[PDB]
Write a protein that binds this DNA or RNA. Structure first.
Ligand code: NA
Ligand code: NA
Ligand code: NA
Length: 327
DNA sequence: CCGACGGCGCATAGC
DNA sequence: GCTAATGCGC
DNA sequence: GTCGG
């Protein structure tokens, strides 16, 4: 595919997607359009007919019709209607602020808060996460070029070991799959001292150190097992300050670690095939454990997992190195 | 025809 | 003050 | 909005 073959169609379906998510608050109609929008992108021909697309899975009748209209006219009536009604547009803008969902945004626009300008006028009417989201509105929409992730992975891995020798940490997401760009940094942490049958100072002490290295600037949310905040790579006094980046850090028990690493490395399509393969061979996978399925469809106690490779060794698959996990 | 569609950690009215 | 429901992001 | 029981 080329992101250029059917760009018009996928842009449209993605426009309709966020409209259902952010304005109409129909989150299943949002996923439907994305599903639709994402399988069209992977089609290696310029679509010529609505029906030609309906063949694909997740493109149904109404999406074919709007594709017919789009190729026939070059715009969507519905989409132009939406584009100019200004409630919809403003609600749509505001939900780009992290911490502003469809509910807050709708309420803001209700009382006439519709621009970033308006939001900083009223930073009192904003909770903490939203203020942070407002402060970094630009930086958060930016891509993180792989080469940055590398040097970031460096600071978090190196300084986590300056804390406890037995912590093990793994950046995941697209970055562990070899992707040239990442949207944020997702870290996965564990410690031998942390079981299912389980210190609550475990995730804190890493964030505490990572805050001394002047790496982590701001905290969106922090608890015993999930942290969500903002890091920034260091500028070498040469007047080019790196953009602030979104980082999460999960603390997971080691007996569920590599299931955590395997899930949160994905990819998404990859997982439903690995599950469904695993399901079709006596076992069942989730983020936490791999369990055997009896003749009844009833699952047993979770199997031991010491390496990510152990998962494939149960289900009789051969280890995929992450680079090849895009489906 | 018609329900499912992901489920869960953290921050933030009702009693 | 305590509990559970909800928005939000992932 | 689309899929499938
Ligand atoms: Na179809
Ligand atoms: Na948002
Ligand atoms: Na958003």
């Amino acid at each position: 595919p080329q992101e250029t073959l059917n760009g018009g169609i996928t842009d449209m379906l993605t426009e309709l997607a966020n409209f259902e998510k952010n304005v109409s608050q129909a989150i299943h109609k949002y996923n439907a359009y994305r599903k639709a929008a994402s399988v069209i992108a992977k089609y290696p021909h310029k679509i010529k007919s609505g029906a030609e697309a309906k063949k694909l899975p997740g493109v149904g009748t109404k999406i074919a019709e709007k594709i017919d209209e789009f190729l026939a006219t070059g715009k969507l009536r519905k989409l132009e209607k939406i584009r100019q009604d200004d409630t919809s547009s403003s609600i749509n803008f505001l939900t780009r602020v992290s911490g502003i969902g469809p509910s807050a945004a709708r309420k803001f626009v209700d009382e006439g808060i519709k621009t970033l300008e308006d939001l900083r006028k009223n930073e009192d009417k904003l909770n903490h996460h939203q203020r942070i989201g407002l402060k970094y509105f630009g930086d958060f929409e930016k891509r993180i070029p792989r080469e940055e992730m590398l040097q970031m992975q460096d600071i978090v891995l190196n300084e986590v070991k300056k804390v406890d020798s037995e912590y093990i940490a793994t950046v995941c997401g697209s970055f562990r799959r070899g992707a040239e760009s990442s949207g944020d940094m997702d870290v996965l942490l564990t410690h031998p001292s942390f079981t299912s049958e389980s210190q609550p100072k475990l995730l804190h002490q890493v964030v505490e150190q990572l805050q001394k290295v002047h790496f982590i600037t701001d905290t969106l949310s922090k608890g015993e097992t999930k942290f969500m905040g903002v890091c920034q790579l260091p500028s070498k006094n040469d007047e080019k300050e790196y953009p602030h980046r979104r980082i999460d850090i999960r603390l997971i028990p080691k007996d569920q670690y590599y299931c955590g690493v395997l899930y949160f490395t994905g990819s998404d399509i990859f997982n439903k095939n690995m599950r469904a393969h695993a399901l079709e061979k006596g076992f069942t996978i989730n983020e936490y454990t791999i369990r055997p399925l009896g003749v009844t469809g009833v699952a047993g106690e979770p199997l031991p997992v010491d390496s990510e490779k152990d998962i494939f060794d149960y289900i009789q698959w051969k280890y995929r190195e992450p680079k090849d996990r895009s489906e």
